[PDB]
Design a protein around this nucleic acid. Structure first.
Ligand SMILES: O=P(O)(O)O[C@H]1[C@@H](OP(=O)(O)O)[C@@H](OP(=O)(O)O)[C@@H](OP(=O)(O)O)[C@@H](OP(=O)(O)O)[C@H]1OP(=O)(O)O
Ligand SMILES: Nc1nc2c(ncn2[C@@H]2O[C@H](COP(=O)(O)OP(=O)(O)OP(=O)(O)O)[C@@H](O)[C@H]2O)c(=O)[nH]1
Ligand SMILES: [Mg+2]
Ligand SMILES: [Zn+2]
Ligand SMILES: [Zn+2]
Ligand SMILES: [Zn+2]
Ligand SMILES: [Zn+2]
Ligand SMILES: [Zn+2]
Ligand SMILES: [Zn+2]
Lengths: 56, 138, 97, 112, 243, 56, 97, 188, 167, 41, 130
RNA sequence: CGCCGCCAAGGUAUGUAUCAAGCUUACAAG
RNA sequence: UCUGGUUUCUCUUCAGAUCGCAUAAAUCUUUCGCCUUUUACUAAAGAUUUCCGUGGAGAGGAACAACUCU
């Protein structure tokens, strides 16, 4: 029983974090390197789901 | 604005469209403004607040007031102007002044419990002006 | 594909035996060995085609020729129109259809 | 690939031209990424794009269609560069596991 | 070690235990053995599959590949040609419906495998012939009826694949009758090339030829079809209507 | 190029050993049950620009 | 076998633990009599039962601690006595050999 | 390097509730002396109080019979050198990083694996006690240990949180009087 | 399509309210493409309709024959007119497996590397006694004959598969 | 209680330590399986 | 097992050579720590009862061999006569009235549950310390 | 009957002594 | 007259099947081929895994579930 949230949440988090060059977010940047392990599995699940040319 | 259903939507969408345009403009302002001073997570409370009020506007416009028909209500949900999920927790009994869906998820919380936004204030201790760290306040 | 066990077989039917067929190469009949009525053997069947193509055949290793002779005889048993021979210059030969 | 779709949804390139776009991307990697340089076994798949490109690109041009750009039939190159990632997920997930380990807890000199 | 298509479990059929072999004892003499012969790809080793599914209530019927498990050998399940028969012993009930026996052999129909059909012709007498309705009589068909009447076996015929005549060639019904009348007339005039048995002709009215489609398991012939006219809404008294 | 695709078709169809994999785990059904991952429903190109931003 | 089986099971669920196990169900309470101070320390703290849960680990974190340390090997097991036969000395001549 | 099951925890750090709920990690922080990865535990002592997690490992607590987070004596509720001078013996431990440091912690752990019940060398002289230390063993402890430390932005008057600032306010600390053995300022 | 030192474009203020242009969308007419017309260009086409699809997991589908005959008409230009596996005599998978095992090639087919059956040997008296310029050659044995049935035209075959024969 | 680097102290999932040959052939009955050794001469 | 065996007292002068804490039973260096299987809900209820109102029932097994009192601060328990937090109480006193705007129509005027309440010399010392 | 398409290390040393950001906890505390 | 259930989400083992109407990458052991040495490699065989997916099964709800198969 956990479900979708508004789409303006991911946008707000990533627009905040930006390029991680501010000092407020320094506790999170370690976790960013930790998500490098699962980046090829993010790119695979991306490119499986390209829109076909008959879509917008 | 993206509509993603090519529908030429039904009636009366023309009387809710300036309202929903105002809420979308305020959501862009509440999405774009900087995060300096706003501490870490109070800079993400207002998107939950205006999402709550947008879903509540369509909510009390349809179930309570019975102005909008069913088809335009399902349209406003299926486009994106409401939650399909949060009205389903507003329809249930004990809770329809709800904050958002993060104070129901009992494993977002570490102790396996629901957040203290969702505690009857009459039966909490008298003066502590706690604001939920997820959703924003009670 | 399966096999159901039979105690005894009355006439009119057909059946497969289990193990009379060491001294046989083609069709023949069987009786009891009691010096009885001497059924003057059924004629061998007429193929209505002539096995005319004729390959010579040889084992690769010249050592173990009787094993391929055993295999060749078992071939000649299981394929009735086959005619195998061996001639004066030593090469075995199979002529078939 | 994402810059192709964002060029389309900025609206300053259209759908036939995008389809020809990312068909060129899937067919001509190696010429525009230099990924083969660091893992050379995938050069096979570069060639397997370039081979099957001919299959499509000489049946577009059957009849009065012309020998220029426009072959936006991009499924058959997309598939093989996904079948690459199908088996390059665990390998370079493991390579990055060892990289992040050695960065965050140091290398072990005379251990193993 | 390798096997050649072994089966076990002596699969349940209808009756064939020792509660019916005791009455198969005298019915081991009224067996009316057949060796069905046909041309190459005329559905007979699938026809025996159709009747063995009629016998057994245990099937792995064709959804993707055909159930030619009477072509048992591994040198014939990859070719699809038939190299070796395996004759079958079943029972078949008739329109009255107690039983008969029908020990039945199904030879390869390839012309170079004209051997093994001969080895069934000197065993049994039933030479029920298979012809494609959609293709006609061909080399092994005419050679094989010739070899059958040279042995003066009982030349009946089960022409097959009329679905292939009409789902595939899509003939109108009168022209389908023209094709079937033509093919029965051609096998009649072909049998009467060696006329020691001048009276013996074949037609549907004699109960001598049964149509079929082994793809979809239909028996046809009018002495059995006017039964299905009879049991529902007829009261016809067939075999005078059927002829 | 025709025959060099038939070569790959044959090499794939020849070496088709049956799938002896034993257990099934999911790694997204494993992630989403944590307090740290949240689900949403986003546009495509948002998610593409999202992961290229994150990869940088 | 069960001892080294649970040893190697915890080992491979720690050497290769990378694949998708559940966390735990740490609802297990623990009661402990604080047997040190209690007179008016938390007046009535006779036995003070607590709820111990286990904090979630996010699967996007690198290793946290620098596993790179080397100290020299410590004191071993203190020596067992030695107990040979009576040790001989040979000569001054075969030792010279 | 170290697992645990339950912490040491003198009574003033638990708080005034007999019913407290507490959370654990598996390799949490490091020990603030020997950098050893213990299992950090966290709880809420009281409703006006900070969380006070866990500061040193179980090994560095079993060495000097010290509680787990506030670094006081488990028998008394006193600092370390008060106990060691009041028992006239120091139970030495090095100062540097390796120089005998992790060597002696490793080996004193290796010879503490059997008991897990009492401190390693203090057991013989923790009996002959209760004369010079019992005059100062402050029972009914003050819970100002557990109060949350003073926030900034009330120090600068900026704190936009208003009432819901969880930490504290209007406690300006004084820069005149605020490790493990010596020397410590309030102990003198 | 984007220069360096340009951060990747920020989907909030850049293309969020920008409408897309147009998809490809080959125009389907009614009276011939009447069944598929309402749903043919849709993300999952029949998703919330219990008559034709499983459900929202989108696992199973059942169509009707007009609705599939129109799809079969639309799906030409990339679908083969071969009604049977009879065009594929000596282009089957098993013909290719035999060609691999026998080091030879069908023309227009794949050319693999040899396998463990690399080098043969026969001493001179033996292959001289079997095979001189003695045999009655009439027409040469092509390699399609050897790949067709690799036993009488080919000595020592192994690791070999055996092709289909006239559907 | 804090073993060497293979146990918990390292995330270095090296290749050559990947679950290969993860089931054991036992010597079956036609070979010299120890039940057929417990009596032989 | 028999009651007389375990309930039999120990002969001796109790060994007062030790301190109070080392003579006391333990398994962990700080008190005998042992597992338990309390109901989750009544644990949470009496926990929240103490956390709000400063009194709860005491948990024990063998303290006095009979223990049925309240703990914390005692007198406020019988001021409320032993009520809980999940009870609609005998009075509704010292409540605090919020102002509500729950239309979702006005903009910058809708405060649902986010409503801020109706209620809404040292710096010399702070500058001399810093 | 139509192979083929290329990165890194291997060279411009390393070893010491003073001088900030990077990264690290935002803690135990009369 | 009585009998009375498809979706969707999580776990629970079994998989023997073109588990997948197509098809990745790795490790080991040998032969190749380029090669100066090592990783990047080559392209065949053998035996192993990982990974992207699936099939049947127990349980918990919720989703019209009361429309009604029975
Ligand atoms: O790869 P490019 O040189 O960019 O050009 C390729 C392709 O090249 P390859 O065949 O070498 O892979 C062929 O062009 P050429 O071989 O003639 O150079 C192809 O086939 P056609 O030339 O028969 O069309 C077509 O070239 P064209 O530009 O004529 O379409 C195509 O071009 P794309 O690069 O646009 O795919
Ligand atoms: N259309 C149609 N095809 C059929 C029918 N019966 C069999 N077939 C097809 O004919 C093909 C070859 O026939 P088989 O099933 O091998 O039977 P067969 O005639 O005995 O072939 P052999 O054993 O070689 O003599 C099969 O693949 C079937 O698909 C039928 O009744 N109608
Ligand atoms: Mg060297
Ligand atoms: Zn709320
Ligand atoms: Zn909320
Ligand atoms: Zn809350
Ligand atoms: Zn420590
Ligand atoms: Zn303490
Ligand atoms: Zn403050």
């Amino acid at each position: 029983q956990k479900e979708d949230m508004p789409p303006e949440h991911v946008r707000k988090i990533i627009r905040d974090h930006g390029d991680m060059t501010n000092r407020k977010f320094r506790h999170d940047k370690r976790v960013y390197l930790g998500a490098l392990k699962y980046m090829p599995h993010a790119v695979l699940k991306l490119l499986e789901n390209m829109p076909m040319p008959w879509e917008q | 604005k993206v509509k993603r259903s090519r529908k030429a939507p039904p009636d009366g969408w023309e009387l809710i469209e300036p309202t929903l345009d105002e809420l979308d403009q305020k959501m862009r302002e509440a999405e774009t403004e900087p995060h300096e001073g706003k501490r870490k997570v109070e800079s993400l409370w207002p998107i939950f607040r205006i999402h709550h009020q947008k879903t509540r506007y369509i909510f009390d416009l349809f179930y309570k007031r019975k102005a909008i028909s069913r088809e335009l209500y399902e349209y406003c949900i299926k486009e994106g102007y409401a939650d399909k999920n949060l009205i389903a927790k507003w329809k249930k009994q004990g809770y329809e002044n709800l904050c958002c869906l993060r104070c129901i998820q009992t494993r977002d919380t570490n102790f396996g419990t629901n957040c203290i936004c969702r505690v009857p204030k009459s039966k909490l201790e008298v003066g502590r002006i706690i604001e939920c760290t997820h959703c924003g306040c009670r | 594909r399966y096999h159901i066990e039979v105690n005894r077989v009355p006439a009119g039917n057909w059946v497969l035996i289990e193990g009379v067929d060491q001294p046989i190469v083609k069709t023949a009949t069987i009786t009891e060995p009691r010096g009885n009525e001497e059924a003057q053997i059924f004629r061998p069947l007429k193929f209505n085609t002539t096995s005319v193509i004729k390959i010579a055949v040889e084992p690769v290793n010249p050592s173990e020729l009787p094993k391929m002779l055993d295999g060749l005889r078992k071939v000649n048993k299981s394929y009735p129109s086959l005619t195998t021979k061996v001639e004066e210059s030593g090469e075995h030969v199979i002529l078939g259809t | 690939v994402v810059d192709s779709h964002v060029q389309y949804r900025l609206g300053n390139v259209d759908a036939f031209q995008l389809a020809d776009g990312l068909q060129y991307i899937f067919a001509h990697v190696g010429q525009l990424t230099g990924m083969y340089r660091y893992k050379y076994k995938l050069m096979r798949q570069i060639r397997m794009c370039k081979d099957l490109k001919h299959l499509i690109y000489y049946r577009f041009n059957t009849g009065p269609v012309g020998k220029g750009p426009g072959c936006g039939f991009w499924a058959a190159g997309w598939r093989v560069w996904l079948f690459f990632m199908r088996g390059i997920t665990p390998l370079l997930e493991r390579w990055l596991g060892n990289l992040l380990a050695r960065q965050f807890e140091g290398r072990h000199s005379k251990g193993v | 070690t390798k096997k050649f298509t072994l089966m076990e479990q002596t699969l349940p059929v209808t009756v064939y235990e020792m509660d019916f072999l005791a009455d198969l004892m005298d019915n081991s003499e009224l067996i009316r053995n057949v060796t069905l012969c046909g041309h190459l790809h005329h559905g007979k080793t699938c026809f025996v599959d159709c009747l063995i599914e009629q016998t057994h209530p245990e099937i792995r019927k064709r959804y993707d590949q055909d159930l030619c498990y009477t072509d048992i050998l591994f040198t014939e399940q990859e070719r699809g040609v038939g190299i070796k028969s395996t004759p079958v012993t079943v029972v078949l009930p008739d329109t009255k419906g107690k039983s008969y026996l029908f020990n039945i052999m199904d030879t390869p129909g390839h012309v170079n495998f004209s051997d093994e059909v001969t080895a069934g012709l000197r065993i049994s007498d039933g030479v029920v012939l298979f012809i494609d309705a959609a293709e006609g009589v061909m080399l092994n068909t005419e050679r094989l009826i010739k070899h059958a009447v040279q042995e003066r076996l009982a030349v009946t015929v089960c022409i097959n694949k009329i679905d292939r005549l009409i789902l595939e060639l899509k003939l109108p019904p009168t022209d389908a009758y023209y094709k079937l009348r033509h093919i029965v007339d051609e096998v009649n005039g072909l049998i009467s090339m060696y006329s020691t048995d001048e009276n013996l002709i074949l037609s549907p009215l004699l109960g001598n030829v049964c149509f079929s489609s082994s793809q979809y398991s239909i028996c046809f012939t009018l002495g059995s079809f006017a039964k299905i006219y009879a049991d529902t809404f007829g009261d016809i008294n067939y075999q005078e209507f059927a002829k | 190029s025709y025959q060099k695709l038939l070569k790959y078709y044959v090499l794939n169809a020849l070496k088709h050993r049956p799938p002896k994999a034993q257990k099934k785990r999911y790694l997204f059904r494993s992630f989403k049950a944590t307090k740290f991952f949240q689900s949403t429903k986003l546009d495509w190109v948002e998610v593409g620009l999202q992961v290229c931003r994150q990869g940088y | 076998r069960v001892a080294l089986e649970k040893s190697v099971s915890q080992k491979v669920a720690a050497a290769m633990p990378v694949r998708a196990a559940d966390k735990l169900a740490p609802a297990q309470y623990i009661r402990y009599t604080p047997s040190q101070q209690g007179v008016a320390f938390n007046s009535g703290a006779k036995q003070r039962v607590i709820r111990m849960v286990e904090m979630q680990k996010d699967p996007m974190e690198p290793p946290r601690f620098k596993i790179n340390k080397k100290i020299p090997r410590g004191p071993p097991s203190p020596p067992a006595p030695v107990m040979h036969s009576p040790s001989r000395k040979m000569t001054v001549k075969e030792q010279q050999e | 390097w170290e697992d645990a099951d339950f912490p040491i925890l003198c009574q003033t750090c638990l708080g005034e509730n007999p019913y407290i709920r507490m959370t654990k990690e598996k390799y949490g922080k490091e020990c603030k002396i020997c950098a050893r990865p213990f299992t950090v535990f966290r709880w809420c002592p009281g409703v006006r109080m900070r969380f006070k997690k866990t500061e040193v490992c179980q090994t560095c607590s079993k060495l000097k019979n010290v509680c787990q987070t506030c670094l006081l004596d488990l028998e008394y509720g006193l600092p370390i050198q008060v106990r060691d001078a009041g028992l006239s013996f120091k139970d030495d431990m090095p100062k540097s990083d390796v120089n005998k440091e992790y060597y002696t912690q490793n080996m004193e752990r290796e010879i503490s694996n059997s008991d897990g019940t009492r401190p390693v060398g203090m057991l013989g002289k923790a009996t002959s006690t209760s004369d010079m230390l019992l005059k100062l063993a402050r029972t009914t402890p003050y819970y100002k240990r557990n109060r949350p430390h003073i926030c900034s932005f009330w120090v600068k008057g900026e704190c936009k949180r208003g009432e819901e600032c969880p930490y504290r306010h209007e406690k300006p600390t004084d820069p005149d009087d605020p490790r493990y053995y010596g020397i410590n300022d309030p102990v003198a | 399509p984007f220069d360096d030192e340009e951060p990747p474009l920020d989907y909030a203020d850049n293309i969020l309210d920008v409408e897309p242009l147009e998809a490809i969308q080959l125009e389907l007419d009614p009276e011939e493409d009447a069944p598929v017309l309402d749903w043919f260009y849709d993300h999952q086409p029949l998703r919330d309709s219990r008559k034709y699809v499983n459900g929202s997991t989108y696992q199973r589908w059942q169509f009707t024959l007009p609705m599939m005959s129109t799809l079969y008409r639309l799906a030409n230009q990339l679908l083969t007119d071969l009604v049977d596996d009879n065009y594929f005599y000596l282009f089957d998978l098993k013909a290719f497996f035999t060609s691999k095992a026998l080091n030879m090639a069908i023309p227009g087919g794949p050319k693999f590397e040899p396998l463990v059956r690399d080098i043969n040997l026969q001493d001179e008296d033996w292959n001289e006694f079997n095979d001189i310029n003695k045999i009655i050659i009439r027409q040469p044995i092509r390699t399609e004959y050897k790949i067709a049935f690799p036993y009488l035209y080919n000595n020592l075959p192994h690791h070999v598969h055996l092709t289909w024969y006239h559907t | 209680k804090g073993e060497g680097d293979l146990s918990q102290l390292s995330k270095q999932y090296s290749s050559r330590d990947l679950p290969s040959h993860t089931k054991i052939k036992y010597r079956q009955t036609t070979q010299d399986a120890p039940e057929e050794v417990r009596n032989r001469d | 097992p028999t009651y007389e065996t375990m309930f039999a007292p120990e002969f001796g002068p109790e060994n007062p050579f030790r301190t109070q804490q080392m003579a006391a039973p333990r398994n962990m260096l700080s008190g005998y720590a042992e597992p338990a299987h309390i109901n989750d809900f009544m644990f949470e209820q009496q926990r929240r009862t103490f956390a709000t109102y400063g009194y709860a029932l005491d948990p024990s097994l063998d303290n006095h061999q009979v223990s049925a009192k309240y703990i914390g601060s005692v007198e406020e328990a019988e001021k409320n006569q032993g009520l809980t937090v999940f009870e609609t109480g005998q009075k509704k006193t010292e409540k605090r009235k919020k102002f509500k705007e729950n239309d979702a129509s006005n903009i910058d005027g809708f405060l649902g549950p986010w409503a801020k309440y109706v209620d809404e010399e040292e710096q010399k010392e702070l500058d001399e310390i810093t």
